A and B are shown apart, each in its own frame.
Chain A
Amino acid sequence: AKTLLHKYSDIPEGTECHRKAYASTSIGGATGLIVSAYSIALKPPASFLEGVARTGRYTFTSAAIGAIFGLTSCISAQVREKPDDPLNYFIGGCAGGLTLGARTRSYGIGAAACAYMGLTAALVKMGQLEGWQVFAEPKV
């Protein structure tokens, strides 16, 4: 639900690195669990044990990505003394991409992942700052 989003957002940007890291880890774990459920449903690989192994691998990868992003972004915002700045999120995003690239053990995904993730996190920070809506309400 939006409960995890509220727990992550209620923390101030430049404080409580541990809390932000924990919330990002929880969000990543939830996303990995959902992706694992879909993958298990659409592709039953060989058995129960292989399925639980795949679920655990996906969940750990997603949680690690979220944790690295949250920790790096919060640390950058704290030490740069410039909160509300999208470069911290970009830095966090790039780190997350790198974490994923290291997990998959290939440089192209890591390099590709770092650039794209950095862009997405910076865009999300810009949207928070400027008030961009992804799901707009029917105003007119």
Chain B
Amino acid sequence: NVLQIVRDHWVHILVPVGFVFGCYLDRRSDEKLTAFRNKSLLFKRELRPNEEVTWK
């Protein structure tokens, strides 16, 4: 029965929500270090016609 089993099983969303938030947090960190994106001597490449960044 909805609105009754929720009061007992709302706990089961905490860990998956933590997982999604952790993935989102990881993505944010990546943006900060883009100082050498497409600038390394090994992977220096010319952009595609509809490409803005080589990686995200």
A and B: direct contact (Cβ < 8 Å)? no
Binding site for A on B (CB under 8 A): none
Binding site for B on A (CB under 8 A): none
